[PDB]
């Protein structure tokens, strides 16, 4: 029941479970109980809509516990990433869509619809309400600060709509950006640990085939062409040729 | 944005109660918000009797649902409620109140004047706390883990539609004065008054939202006397 939230990067991105596409933990362990438990059109969608705020709030919640109870910009992240993925699952446009997640969409289903246009009814029900799911995953923030409250979360950046994999991929390189100092300071700090930041550095190539490849099925079917773009915009100061040189094991360090 | 009650006052007993909520500032064709009605017997504490969605959809305190009808009007500004075959423990005033549909946990503002008709989540608080001018009262709401609510406070003056002075545990409504403050952690919330002066003896009540039903639950109420 929206459970604790395990640790950073406790669990890697799964490419698994799904081949297609590599899942992070965190939208394994998204909230969505009053949305599982959902087992006059007007009157259900505002009952789906309290639904998703306590979900939301709870999800904004745990993710501040996460973070140490610290309002920062990481926390912001993370709200962020949360909230693009409640609005795919709304909108249908959500890549995991196991167990739980099925639930979730035929709960939807019965609520918009199953003809042809309902898909459009979810994605304009998502954006009048999206901004409000928003505010609700920060309730914990507001409830703890003895203050006023103050916004160092950006509403544009999080309410803005992108593909689901675009978002995944900023995630993925603020993930791989952390790990990388962790596992070459590892390796400088040794044939134990060669064979395991080779192991390492074999599931981010992996991940990044499997993300990349996704991107171009979903691009195909905003200044961004290509996968790398999407890291130019998120990370500070990235270079793709160090980038590919380091899944590579070609970088001029390892 | 101002609500009021309209109704008889006097009511015949097997017959049924007509009351009317004329909301004006602003448009009640909206789904920013909940249109409820609430009941006060005399000296007792606040009853939730129904919620009406401007979809015309409402939903009534499973107590009362088979004498209860809440309607609602887009093109007149107004919601009503109807007591069908009213007994003598209908007595009480009739609250209408306002709460939003877009927050976590919904609070009442504003409310109607109030008008007296004559013929499971369960909050905590104390009958009465007694302090003498200018010492500090604590009026404590006890809430089986309330700290993952947010609780509300309202300040009802005798004759009065109560007033609310605390809201998502301690905001302060703008005519509020700094002296109230509001708490909230473990299973017990707080309202703080501090310097407390004679005007405010009131009765205090805690509120609360119930996520599956999605309904205030109101505290029984607190007493603040000032002893001289």
């Known amino acids: 029941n929206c459970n604790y939230k395990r640790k950073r990067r406790e669990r890697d991105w799964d490419c698994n479970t799904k081949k297609d596409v590599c899942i992070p933990d965190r939208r394994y362990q998204l909230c969505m109980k009053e949305l599982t438990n959902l087992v006059d059109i007007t009157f259900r969608k505002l009952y789906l809509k309290r639904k998703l705020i306590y979900d939301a709030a709870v999800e904004g919640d745990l993710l501040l516990k996460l973070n140490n109870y610290r309002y920062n910009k990481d926390f912001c992240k993370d709200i962020r990433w949360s909230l693009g993925d409640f609005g795919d699952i709304i909108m249908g446009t959500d890549m995991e869509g196991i167990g739980y997640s099925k639930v979730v969409e035929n709960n939807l289903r019965s609520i918009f619809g199953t003809d042809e246009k309902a898909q459009q009814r979810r994605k304009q029900w998502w954006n009048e309400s999206k901004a409000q799911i928003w505010t609700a995953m920060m309730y914990s923030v507001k409830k703890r600060l003895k203050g006023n409250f103050i916004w160092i979360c950006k509403l544009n950046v999080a309410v803005n709509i992108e593909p689901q994999i675009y978002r995944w991929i900023r995630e993925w390189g603020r993930d791989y950006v952390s790990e990388l100092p962790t596992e070459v300071q590892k390796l400088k700090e040794c044939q134990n640990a060669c064979k395991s930041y080779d192991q390492w550095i074999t599931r981010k190539k992996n991940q990044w085939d499997v993300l990349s490849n996704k991107f171009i099925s979903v691009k195909n079917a905003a200044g961004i062409v290509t996968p790398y773009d999407i890291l130019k915009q998120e990370l500070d100061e990235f270079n793709e040729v160090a980038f590919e040189n380091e899944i590579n094991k070609r970088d001029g360090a390892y | 944005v101002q609500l009021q009650e309209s109704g008889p006052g006097l009511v015949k007993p097997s017959q049924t109660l007509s009351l009317t909520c004329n909301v004006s500032g602003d448009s009640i064709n909206s789904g920013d918000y909940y249109w409820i009605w609430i009941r006060q017997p005399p000296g007792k504490g606040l009853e939730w009797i129904g919620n009406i969605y401007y979809s015309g959809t409402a939903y009534y305190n499973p107590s009362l649902k088979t004498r209860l009808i809440i309607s609602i009007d887009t093109s007149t500004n107004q919601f009503s409620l109807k007591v069908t075959s009213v007994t003598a423990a209908d007595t009480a005033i009739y609250y209408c109140?306002?709460?939003?549909?877009?927050?976590?946990?919904?609070?009442?503002?504003?409310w109607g004047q109030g008008t007296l008709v004559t013929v499971s989540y369960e909050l905590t608080q104390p009958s009465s706390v007694a302090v003498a001018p200018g010492q500090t009262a604590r009026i404590p709401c006890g809430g089986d883990n309330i700290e993952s609510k947010g609780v509300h406070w309202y300040q009802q003056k005798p004759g009065q539609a109560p007033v609310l002075v605390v809201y998502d545990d301690h905001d302060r409504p703008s005519g509020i004065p700094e002296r109230f403050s509001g708490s909230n952690s473990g299973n017990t919330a707080t309202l703080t008054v501090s310097r407390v002066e004679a005007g405010d003896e009131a009765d205090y009540y805690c509120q609360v939202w119930d996520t599956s039903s999605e309904h205030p639950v109101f505290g029984g109420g607190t007493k603040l006397t000032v002893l001289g």
């Open positions: 109140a306002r709460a939003s549909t877009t927050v976590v946990s919904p609070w009442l503002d504003p």
